[PDB]
């Protein structure tokens, strides 16, 4: 439906698509510009857009445009054809992308289908007219002039080059595409120079990389744009009240009017500031707009400009532009729910942040986040940098994670930094009665008291066919999505039509005001801490000190906010043979110190950070005194540089009609009743956009500040360890060797753990401030609101006391308006994965999920299935190797990395236990140079070792009994996790804490960046391991974290026979009791009864070794019952309806129960199969316990459909143990927690390879 | 300490707290007694030269306060990062018992100073006397010699541990025995201050007993105040768990860090004279091969790694008595616990909390299979159940939480459903509108009543509703979202009764699993039980019943839920579509799930089947030219689907074919047909489907 042309700037002209455009701001001034048809009814000029702007403000100066950017000059760009052909085709690929997916496709078939209204407020309602400047554009086909419609016009940037905007035409003060008719709508973009943003708000754990940095894909600025060219054309682009912010105070950052239209664009919880009050009104506008147009399009019956213009066709595609209905007769009416699913798909469907997600690209998380300054693009055209695709995260570059493809940290070869020199920005001069330079774009962000309205005062009239009207800030975007059609093709009328001959219309003028305001403050808040963390370049020799105005007042001194102990460390001077031990320390104590919360359980706030305050000296001078006892003290308004006055009206009266109809005064009541609860959620309305666009604002500076200055303290220890270190001689220097690549990743890791900290609390805080200080003011008078109704209704039922034969409904009242409604903050609102090694089964072959694209090379030797389980054997081609990116590694230095997975061990050989106890053989290795880790297997151990660079080894290991007659450990499948960091090494089994060592005596380890799975040493030919869900982190995981994987990876639909693999029908198995682990079951020699004997043990040879026989009793057999799932999978799933057989001499015997027992217990009835109203043969099989285990439960059930439970399966005893059905036990299961050791716990054990007589 | 611990005892019954003991023991007047809790003594002087108490709203408020005060500084706690894991250190051991309270915070000293320092009586070790006889000698061939060098090894490894084993012993009595005498004395500083506050409040009782107050109001103070006493007590009880914990983790790690190095290095003085020993034996053997004599060596040699002994795990279960195991079978956190079998023909309702619940039903009630189990149905007009417990009548200072799943198969008249009101104190639940309300009052007439919607009938409800008064929070959420967070700071004592009354009052209803817990819970605690409870092996539908076989049902896509499918003719074929905007008032199409085996009727994951449609009886078949699903008038040519459903999306199934999920499809011209999808275009949760009553 929507085609992208191809052409080049210099292909001759057709006067088709390529045509002498005129645009509507030349005033019949001529220059015409050579414009392309890149799509039906879209045109591009690749020219700089001068309209309004003077030829002068080109060149950057002294002033600036706006107070809000940093902006970037280039006349000479776009000075030469070559450079237009450039612009031209990226805006091709552009678009492509945009088309690329269902939904960018929906957008642009929207945008050419909503062509502009034939007319204006100018027009008179029964006659259409195209000579508007907003409808027609000429062009020229001479070597005079006609005429052509058009939708959008591109332009290139302005004077400003990362400053893109969409206008609309507007004639005599008047915006037809804000009126309901819509008209042609110009833009200025550039996809070069795109802006930057961060991600301090998001939380990704200890990133080295995360918070670095990002820069926007140009395919979502245009697609921003293109939304306002929408909402302009549809005549939707209205003005209401808008944000405007305060500058009463000094801190107070300054910006233009905010109208809603640009937080509904932006999406997230930016429309949440704008009160439902102010959506109401623009929702009633919008309406009045389209009951205008609709009335207009009825009363339309020729046209007097274009009399060869269809006017049924146009009537029928505006039809379907507003989504209007035909009556059978032909008059156009607007229909409520088509109209509302139109207004809330363009406002609330069409948004930034919905488009990011559906795109897989980031974006900033609000309006009001701070924006750092733009970065030029090497080349838009390369398929190995930008594909049309994936854009920038490209998974074939390994660049999907975690949208690595934007980071500029990374992808720092698709980028380049702009020169200071020709960037602008609006600054403030504060200087004390010396004077500091701060961004206005630094400050907070206020809105004044007069941004919200107060529409909640007014008087209401009730009536019997009042509706209540509520405008949700949310569409579902699937729903956009299914409804594109990618197959039907457009019939829109001929461009073409006749020369404009009106040439009216206001040209907007822009000037420039001066980049930078002085001002005189004394207080020294945020700003001036913040500035005491700096130093200037040249100093090279300085100090750590804790006085704020020592730091101020001596260049060579950096202001700090961390413990005594580490600024006297800072400063510590020590020989060469210490530095590496001084500068470990150090940075651990950096991380250390950072990192420091107390937890809090009086307030509903999880842990508090005590050194913001010393930071940043926010507020009620945060720094004197301890900060957690004022916190505790004065709750969250300390930090706050401002209370903001809180807007709260007094509801409005209502004053209902005398409808005698009782039913027409009955409906009345309940009117009211709904009509109160939506004010309710008006007040909360309001209440939560001044919490979100006055106190919120200004703990996100809090939290800008903060890694500011965390940023500035890494900056200053690195300064200081490199002028240490070249205070050092040669000599000393070739002994020491440190890597300052690893020092800045453990930093970086530091601070962003810091800053999750910090973002929980300061979240923690500002939802707890609205909840306490906001809240309760605007129930009180909403509960004296209620109150008034309560009375109001009362005089009103009983001035109708006569009709309406009311007690029914004085009660109702009365208990209605008891109640409060509640407030739901999330109306309003919107695995570890440190992993880098994750190895995954794709197809009959293994693969590393991280998305770091580690290059695996699996053999021939190797057996893997679909349980993600492989096994290594003896021979020479079972081997695996994989290959680590080399940007992707475990810190050499400090030595912080995890590496999980699950193992099964095969059991010793009896006669074979000398070679067991002293054979080691290496079973992982990752070693280069004799440096790196290994694992390897020492018969009843599994050690860990780490080699050093100079050698020294250090080993952690597990030991699991062999002496125990059951062991957990022999052949089962066990999940092994090792951690290590810079001081200890320590082994979790299951997730237990099992053994840990002190490696303080390690000096540095290399990543071998090759790991080798294979069987390596003095192994017998029969070794064989199987191994599963092997993954490594970067980071040292904590009990908690092992716990919940070791969970989650223990999870699974189906169940686990003995060995912990999964259970399968039509297999044959031996039982084992958990709570009589050295009992087993025999077939009775008469009776047809089992009997329980005891377990025979290991007696032959040795003491050093006991276990008893686990291949013994008759041999069991689940059978399907109903047969009616796929018998190609034969895996026993929970809650399975199943017969439980065993093998007695050539036959298949059955085990059945009595149907009707006194007794709590009762022996089993094991007898062959057959059908008989005697015994149920029904069995269930249960999983209760909710930890891991290989144990099942086993019920009788009288029919699958009947809910009567006949009992659970088991083994009691006066001795004489027995095979018994109990009733007793369906209560104890559910005794939480479940008892691991009763006798209704049965595993299964089916012959393996692993374990022998 | 011991000095530190009698400075918290006291005879005056008007005494005074303070902070100061050398204050308080110059004391000539005895009028002090030493207490580190904070929190109390900053709030009694912060009330100090106030208005005297006279209302029993003051004194209500007085009361609550100490509680809070006292239950947060008794159970402070911090936690730090120690080798072995993370240990919860309690912050005000320190002021107890005078142990590294030279300065500064406790915690401070403890982390930049081991677990070691807190006993004043270290180095105690001795090397025990070791004797290791040397290898006797007769030749013999390396066969032989082989089992009996093998032999020698293995006693040494055991003599190794005998040694391990006796270091054991030796930390156990001379180590473990300061940390539990140190765990003795803080468990009886906490009963001290227990005591003290607690006399504190008889004291203030017994002031106020002599005024102008009704005998009633006196009454239920004396009652709140016995209630308040239990309270402490639990909070006394949870400090002294911290205490034991933290403690045993600190005697544990001191045993790593302090002890197994001089283990270590006291056997790596000895491994020397082994291997010296059987290298001079092997060397005097002369029936043997220069190599195997070189292979013997490497073999029968022993390495540090040889005699590490070390498992924490061993450690902390040698340390765990069948009393410890008998108190964590015996710990619960439910007041109540409904346990439901329908058996045969013998229905047993009960508690099995342990708590014993006297439980009073009516023999008219019902069970069904609600959810995951026996559900009450309570049908018949006029039928109540009552659940008795002294617990029940909360009180003042006491936090806890009701937590069940609803249905209700009637309407939306105003009704009655749980309540535990006496006149006017207690909380109420009622229907009321098309939503339930939730209303609790306290003894001084302030009242709070919230009104959770959408509790339309037909439909399976989770209620789970909290009240914790250390925060001074209610929280309600209904299936898994969270519907209040009010603040009850002015919601006084709510003593209401030892019975909590059940009733239906003319609407049928299913409750299932009914649980009374006697603290609050936390978000994520009611999500995990959510979607764990659901997790049952049982595909449900819409409405949240089981779904069955043969039934009649209707079709709806999880991104429109409002378009129910209807059959279209296109091309001489039948096409499931979905109705278009103008024409929304068609009838949507009836289904039927057919299976193998037509004896089964409650549908589970993973069960083959085939879908039957109602004229003809038309079957499901997928089309091979365009991949729409069409219908087919033949059981034979009809396609076997699987069902199934996400665990996070409980009401709604998935049909697959050949591992293809159906799906939905983009619009074309008024139309979204229904397709074996394998485009990753559309999005995932397009092929998520309900299926609803008809």
Redesign the interface.
């Known amino acids: 439906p929507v085609t992208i042309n191809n052409f080049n700037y210099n292909d001759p002209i057709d006067n088709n698509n390529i045509i002498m455009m005129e645009p509507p701001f030349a005033r019949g001034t001529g220059r015409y510009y050579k414009a392309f048809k890149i799509t039906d009814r879209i045109w591009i000029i690749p020219e700089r857009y001068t309209f309004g702007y003077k030829p002068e403000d080109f060149n950057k100066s002294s002033g600036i445009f706006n107070r809000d950017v940093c902006e970037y000059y280039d006349p000479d760009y776009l000075n030469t054809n070559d450079k237009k052909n450039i612009f031209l085709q990226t805006m091709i690929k552009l678009f492509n992308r945009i088309k690329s997916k269902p939904l960018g496709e929906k957008l642009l078939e929207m945008i050419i289908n909503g062509i502009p209204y034939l007319g204006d407020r100018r027009v008179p309602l029964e006659e259409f007219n195209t000579n508007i400047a907003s409808v027609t554009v000429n062009k020229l086909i001479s070597n005079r002039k006609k005429g052509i419609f058009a939708n959008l016009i591109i332009f290139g940037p302005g004077p400003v080059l990362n400053e893109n905007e969409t206008i609309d035409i507007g004639i005599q003060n008047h915006f037809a595409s804000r009126e309901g008719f819509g008209g042609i709508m110009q833009m200025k973009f550039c996809p070069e120079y795109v802006s930057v943003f961060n991600n301090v708000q998001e939380n990704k754990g200890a990133s080295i990389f995360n918070r670095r940095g990002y820069f926007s894909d140009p395919a979502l600025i245009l697609m921003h744009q293109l939304i306002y060219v929408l909402h302009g054309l549809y005549g939707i682009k209205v003005d209401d009240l808008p944000i405007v912010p305060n500058e009463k105070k000094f801190f107070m950052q300054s910006t233009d009017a905010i109208q809603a239209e640009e937080l509904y664009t932006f999406g997230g919880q930016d429309p949440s500031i704008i009160t439902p009050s102010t959506d109401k009104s623009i929702y009633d506008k919008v309406l009045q707009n389209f009951r205008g147009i609709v009335d207009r399009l009825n009363k339309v019956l020729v046209c007097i400009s274009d009399p060869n213009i269809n006017i049924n066709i146009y009537k029928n595609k505006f039809k379907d532009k507003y989504k209007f209905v035909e009556d059978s007769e032909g008059k156009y009416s607007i229909d409520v729910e088509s109209f509302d699913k139109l207004y809330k798909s363009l406002m609330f469907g069409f948004t930034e942040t919905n488009i990011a997600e559906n795109y897989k690209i980031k974006t900033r998380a609000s309006y009001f986040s701070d924006s750092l300054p733009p970065v030029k693009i090497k080349n838009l055209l390369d398929n190995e940098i930008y594909t049309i695709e994936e854009g920038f995260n490209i998974s074939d570059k390994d660049m999907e994670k975690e949208y690595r493809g934007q980071n500029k940290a990374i992808n720092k070869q698709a980028y380049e930094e702009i020169s200071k020199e020709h960037l602008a920005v609006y600054k403030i001069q504060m200087c004390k009665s010396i004077c500091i330079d701060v961004d206005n774009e630094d400050l907070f962000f206020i809105a004044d008291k007069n941004s919200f309205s107060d529409d909640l005062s007014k008087n209401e009239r009730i009536e019997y066919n009042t509706q209540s009207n509520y405008i949700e800030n949310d569409f579902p975007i699937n729903e956009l999505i299914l409804d594109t059609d990618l197959i039907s093709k457009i019939e829109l009328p001929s461009e073409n039509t006749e020369s404009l001959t009106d040439f009216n219309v206001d040209v907007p003028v822009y000037e420039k005001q001066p980049a930078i305001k002085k001002i005189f403050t004394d207080e020294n808040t945020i700003f001036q801490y913040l500035y005491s963390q700096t130093f200037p370049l040249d100093i090279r020799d300085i100090s750590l000190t804790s006085s704020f105005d020592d730091a101020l007042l001596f260049s060579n001194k950096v202001y700090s906010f961390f413990s005594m102990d580490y600024i006297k460390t800072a400063n510590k001077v020590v020989e060469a043979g210490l530095f590496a031990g001084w500068v470990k320390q150090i940075v651990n104590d950096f991380v250390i110190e950072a990192n420091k919360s107390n937890t809090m359980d009086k307030i509903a706030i999880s842990l508090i950070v005590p050194y913001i305050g010393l930071a940043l000296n926010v507020g009620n001078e945060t720094a004197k005194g301890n900060f957690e006892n004022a916190f505790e003290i004065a709750g969250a308004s300390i930090l706050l540089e401002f209370i903001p006055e809180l807007l709260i009206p007094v509801v409005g009266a209502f004053l209902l009609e005398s409808y005698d109809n009782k039913n027409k005064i009955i409906k009345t009541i309940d009117n009211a009743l709904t009509k109160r609860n939506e004010k309710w959620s008006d007040m909360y309305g309001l209440i939560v956009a001044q919490w979100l666009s006055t106190v919120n604002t200004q703990f996100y500076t809090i939290k800008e500040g903060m890694y500011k200055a965390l940023n500035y303290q890494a900056q200053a220890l690195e300064e200081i360890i490199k002028y240490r270190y070249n205070i050092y001689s040669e000599k000393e220097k070739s002994n020491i060797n440190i890597d300052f690549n690893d020092i800045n990743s453990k930093l970086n890791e530091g601070i962003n753990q810091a800053i999750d900290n910090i973002n929980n609390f300061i979240n923690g805080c500002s939802v707890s401030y609205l909840m306490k200080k906001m809240i309760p003011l605007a129930v009180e008078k909403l509960l004296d609101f209620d109150n008034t109704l309560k009375k109001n209704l009362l005089n009103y039922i009983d001035e109708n006391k006569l009709y309406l034969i009311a007690e029914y409904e004085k009660s109702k009242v009365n208990k209605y308006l008891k109640t409060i409604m509640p407030f739901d903050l999330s109306i309003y609102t919107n695995i570890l994965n440190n992993i880098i090694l994750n190895l995954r089964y794709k197809d009959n072959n293994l693969i590393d999920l991280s998305g770091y694209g580690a290059k695996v090379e699996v053999y021939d030797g190797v057996e893997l299935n679909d349980k993600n389980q492989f096994k290594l054997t003896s021979s020479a081609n079972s081997k695996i190797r994989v290959t680590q990116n080399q940007n992707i590694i475990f810190n050499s230095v400090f030595l912080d990395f995890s590496v999980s997975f699950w193992i099964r061990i095969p059991k010793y050989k009896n006669d074979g236990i000398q070679n067991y106890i002293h054979n080691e053989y290496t079973i992982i290795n990752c070693m280069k140079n004799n440096s790196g880790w290994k694992i390897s297997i020492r018969g009843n151990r599994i050690i860990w070792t780490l080699i050093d660079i100079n050698g020294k080894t250090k080993s952690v290991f597990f030991e699991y009994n062999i002496r125990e007659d059951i062991s957990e450990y022999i052949n089962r499948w066990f999940f092994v996790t090792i951690t290590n960091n810079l001081n200890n090494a320590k082994i979790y089994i299951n997730g237990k804490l099992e053994s840990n060592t002190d490696i303080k005596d390690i000096r540095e380890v290399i990543a071998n960046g090759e790991i080798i799975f294979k069987l390596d040493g003095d192994i017998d030919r029969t070794q064989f391991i199987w191994m599963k869900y092997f993954s490594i982190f970067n980071t040292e995981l904590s009990q908690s974290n092992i716990e919940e994987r070791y969970k989650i990876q223990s999870y699974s639909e189906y169940l686990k026979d003995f060995w912990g693999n999964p259970l399968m029908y039509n297999k044959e198995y031996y039982m084992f009791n958990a709570g009589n682990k050295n009992s087993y079951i025999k077939l009775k020699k008469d009776s047809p009864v089992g009997e329980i004997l005891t377990r025979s043990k290991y007696n032959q040879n040795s003491k050093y070794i006991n276990y008893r026989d686990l291949y013994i009793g008759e041999k069991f057999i689940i059978r399907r019952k109903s047969n009616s799932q796929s018998i190609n999978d034969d895996i026993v799933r929970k809650e399975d309806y199943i017969y439980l057989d065993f093998f007695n001499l050539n036959q298949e015997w059955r085990v059945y129960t009595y149907k009707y027992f006194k007794k709590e217990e009762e022996k089993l009835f094991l007898a062959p199969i057959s059908d008989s109203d005697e015994f149920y043969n029904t069995i269930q099989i249960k999983e209760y316990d909710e930890q891991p285990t290989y144990s099942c439960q086993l019920l009788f059930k009288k029919d699958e459909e009947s809910t009567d439970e006949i009992g659970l399966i088991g083994i009691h005893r006066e001795y004489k143990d027995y095979f018994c059905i109990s009733k007793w036990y369906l209560k104890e299961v559910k005794r939480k927690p479940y008892n691991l050791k009763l006798g209704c716990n049965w595993q299964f054990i089916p012959k393996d390879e692993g374990w022998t007589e | 300490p011991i000095n530190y611990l009698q400075a918290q005892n006291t005879n005056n019954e008007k005494f005074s707290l303070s902070s100061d003991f050398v204050e308080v023991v110059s004391s000539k007047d005895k009028s002090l007694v030493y207490s580190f809790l904070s929190n109390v003594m900053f709030y009694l002087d912060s009330i100090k030269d106030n208005s005297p108490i006279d209302t029993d709203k003051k004194y209500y408020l007085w009361l609550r306060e100490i509680f ?1 005060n006292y239950s ?1 500084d008794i159970t402070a ?3 730090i990062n120690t ?4 240990n919860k250190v309690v912050t005000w051991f320190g002021k107890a018992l005078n142990i590294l309270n030279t300065s500064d915070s406790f915690v401070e000293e403890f982390q930049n100073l081991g677990p070691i320092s807190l006993i004043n009586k270290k180095e105690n070790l001795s090397m025990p006397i070791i004797e290791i006889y040397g290898i006797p000698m007769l030749g013999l061939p390396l066969n032989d010699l ?1 089992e009996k060098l ?1 032999n020698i090894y ?1 006693k040494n490894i055991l003599y190794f541990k005998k040694v391990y084993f006796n270091f054991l012993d030796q930390w156990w009595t001379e180590y473990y025995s300061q940390y539990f005498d140190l765990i003795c004395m803080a468990k009886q500083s906490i009963l001290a201050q227990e005591k003290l506050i607690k006399q504190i409040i008889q004291n203030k009782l017994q002031d106020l007993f002599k005024a102008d107050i009704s005998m009633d109001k006196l009454n239920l103070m004396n009652l709140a105040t016995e209630k308040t006493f239990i309270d402490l007590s639990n909070e006394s009880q949870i400090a002294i768990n911290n205490i034991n914990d933290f403690l045993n983790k600190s005697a544990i790690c001191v045993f ?2 302090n002890i197994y190095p001089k283990f270590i290095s006291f056997m790596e003085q000895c491994i020397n004279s082994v291997n010296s020993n059987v290298t001079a034996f092997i060397q005097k053997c002369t029936n043997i091969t220069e190599d195997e004599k070189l292979q013997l060596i490497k ?1 029968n040699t022993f390495m540090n ?1 040889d005699f ?1 002994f ?4 061993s450690i902390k279960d040698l340390i765990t008595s069948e009393t410890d195991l008998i108190k964590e ?1 015996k710990e ?1 956190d ?1 007041n109540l ?1 409904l ?1 439901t ?4 023909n013998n229905k047993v309702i009960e508690d ?1 909390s ?1 708590k014993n619940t006297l439980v009073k039903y009516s023999d008219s009630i019902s ?3 609600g959810v995951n189990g ?1 559900a009450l149905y309570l049908k018949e007009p006029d039928e109540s159940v009552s659940f008795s417990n002294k617990a029940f009548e909360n009180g003042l200072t006491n936090s806890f939480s009701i937590c069940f799943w609803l249905r209700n198969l009637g309407e939306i008249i ?1 009704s009655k459903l749980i309540e535990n009101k006496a006149d006017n104190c207690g909380w109420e639940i009622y229907f ?2 098309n939503g339930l ?1 939730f209303s609790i009052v306290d003894c001084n007439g302030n ?6 919607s959408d509790v339309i009938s037909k439909n399976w409800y989770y209620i789970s509703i909290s009240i914790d008064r ?2 001074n ?1 209610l929280l ?1 959420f209904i299936n898994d ?7 009850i700071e002015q919601i006084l004592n709510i003593y209401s009764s030892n019975t909590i009354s059940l009733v239906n009052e003319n609407n049928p209803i299913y409750i299932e699993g009914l649980s009374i817990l006697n603290r609050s819970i936390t978000s994520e605690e009611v999500v995990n039980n959510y979607f ?1 409870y659901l997790n ?3 595909i449900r539908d819409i409405s949240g019943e089981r779904l069955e076989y043969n039934k009649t049902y209707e079709l709806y896509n999880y ?2 839920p409002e378009n129910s499918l209807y059959e279209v003719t296109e091309n001489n074929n039948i096409y499931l579509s979905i109705k278009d ?2 024409n929304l008032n068609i009838q949507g199409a009836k289904f039927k799930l057919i ?3 037509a ?4 549908v ?6 085939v879908v039957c449609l109602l004229d003809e009886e038309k079957y499901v078949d997928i089309s091979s030219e365009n991949n729409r699903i069409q219908l087919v008038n033949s059981k034979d040519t009809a396609k ?1 689907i ?1 069902f199934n459903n996400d665990i996070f999306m409980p009401n709604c199934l998935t049909f697959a074919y050949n591992n293809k999920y159906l799906s ?1 499809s ?4 008024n139309y ?1 047909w229904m397709i074996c999808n394998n485009n990753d ?1 559309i ?1 995932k ?2 092929h998520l489907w309900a299926l609803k009553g008809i």
Do not use: H, M
């Open positions: 809070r947060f706690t911090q936690e080798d072995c894991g993370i082989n093998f293995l790593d860090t073999l790694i590490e070390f498992d924490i795990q079978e619960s439910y616990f346990f079998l329908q058996e045969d099995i342990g069970l069904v299979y026996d105003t009321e509108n309300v009242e709070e009543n919230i009104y959770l250390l925060r929070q309600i979202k969270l519907i209040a967070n009010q603040s764990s049952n092996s049982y991104v429109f905007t103008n299976n193998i085996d004896n089964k009727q409650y589970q994951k993973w069960d083959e089947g076997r699987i939905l983009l619009r074309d011209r979204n275009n999005p949760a397009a």
